[PDB]
Structure formats: structure tokens, C-alpha cells
């Protein structure tokens, strides 16, 4: 019901910009379409989609979780814009490896890692 | 003053413990030994530590804070269980790599990059 209306309005939102956004900023281009949701429910739609693996989730340096749907369902990782939240798709084999061996070396379960490189594009650059 | 000497407190609070605390957890701690430090100092101290490079920070899977102060000055990375919070100081030099040219061959300035491993450490495993 308001569920998957909500979801997919939320999930359309975030295919209509390549940056990644913070839930109030999401919230705003909702309410710019008229939408009625809340910042609490967007909030937590994007939560669940996270968890589902159906947008990637990342903290910017004020500790802000920021979201992105991204192209591809391949595992991956990013290189961020802490200026404007741009951002490139990368996969990094050797990192993944090295990830797996010193878990699997330290006796460690239920591995996860995370892994994000933050920087300044060019055109934030010249601000 | 009042500044140097609750530095001093939490800085030395951390040095108790080898694991990842949050900063309620600290405060908890500074609590026990008779301290009159309040939340919000304790976490602002801590996160003016982690600015100076006096202690290592990273988020849970639940997005809270957490502190270690390590043993090393070195550049590393850590391993940590998600259950208990203790950890593994850890290098990577491919990966230092990797994100250096990934970054620099996208044209990003200011780089700056974050790697944590995630896992449960056999003793928390048998719950
Ligand atoms: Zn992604
Ligand atoms: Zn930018
Ligand atoms: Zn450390
Ligand atoms: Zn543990």
C-alpha cells in the first residue's frame, strides 16, 4: 500500500540524480513534485532499500549519511565528491582479496568492509 | 583549563580499554572513576581527538560513533567485530595504492579515503 507507493517514488527520486543525497535533500525533490511524505519516512524507505541492496549508502565527513542508486548490481565501491556528491562506480579486486585474508586470517565471521574514497572533483574544485 | 584537563580524562579513558567505544560508553566510564564531565563534552573532545589524529573513529553498522586510540602513528586501518568492538590495526599497502590512482586518474584533489573490515571475532561468534 503506502509502502510501495512510497518506495517507488522514493526509488524514481533517486534516479533522477548521478550524486548521492542526504534523506533531506531527497525529501525536498519530493515535496517538489508535490509528494505528501514525510522526512521520517523517506528516512526510512531508504533505510529498507539500503538493506536490500537496492541503493548504496555512505557517511560524508559530518558524519551525514548521503544515498545513490548506482548502475550496476556488481559489488562496487566509490570515489565521492564532498563538494557536490558526485560520484564514480569503482571495483577494486586486490582491495577485495586483501578484505577477505585478513578476516579470514584473523579468525573473523560474517565478513562485511567498507570502503570509499572521498575527494574534490575539478569543477568543485574552482568554488 | 577546564579544556586540557578533560582532554586528559578522555584521552586517558581510552587508554583503558583496547576496544572501539562510543562516546556514551566513555562517558559511561568517566562516569565510574568519579568524573563530572557531561555527554556533550565528552563528545566533543573526542571528536576534536579525532581531527588531531589522537584517535582512530568509525562507524557501526547502526551509523553510531565509535573510538579507539591505537597503538601506532602509522597510517592504518582496522578489522573490527561488530559484537565487542575489538580490533586489528592494519595495512594495506595495495590498497593505499589503488586509491591514489584512482583518485588522481579521476582528476580529485584533497583525497582522502576510509577502509574498515567488519566481522565477528570467535568469542563473540559463540553467543
Ligand atoms: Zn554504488
Ligand atoms: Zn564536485
Ligand atoms: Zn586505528
Ligand atoms: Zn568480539
Not at 23 to 38: F, I, P, R, S, T
Request: hydrophobic fraction near 40%; proline fraction near 1%; charged fraction near 25%.
Amino acid at each position: 500500500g503506502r509502502a510501495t507507493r512510497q518506495r517507488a517514488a522514493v526509488s524514481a527520486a533517486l534516479q533522477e540524480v548521478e550524486e548521492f543525497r542526504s534523506a533531506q535533500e531527497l525529501h525536498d525533490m519530493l515535496k517538489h513534485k508535490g509528494d505528501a511524505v514525510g522526512l521520517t519516512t523517506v528516512y526510512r524507505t531508504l533505510q529498507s532499500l539500503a538493506d536490500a541492496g537496492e541503493v548504496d549508502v555512505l557517511r560524508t565527513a559530518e558524519g551525514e549519511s548521503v544515498y545513490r542508486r548506482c548502475s550496476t548490481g556488481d559489488h562496487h565501491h566509490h570515489l565521492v565528491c564532498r563538494a557536490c556528491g558526485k560520484a564514480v562506480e569503482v571495483e577494486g579486486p586486490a582491495v577485495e582479496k586483501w578484505a577477505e585474508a585478513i578476516a579470514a586470517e584473523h579468525g573473523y565471521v560474517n565478513v562485511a568492509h567498507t570502503v570509499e574514497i572521498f575527494g574534490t572533483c575539478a569543477d568543485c574544485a574552482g568554488a
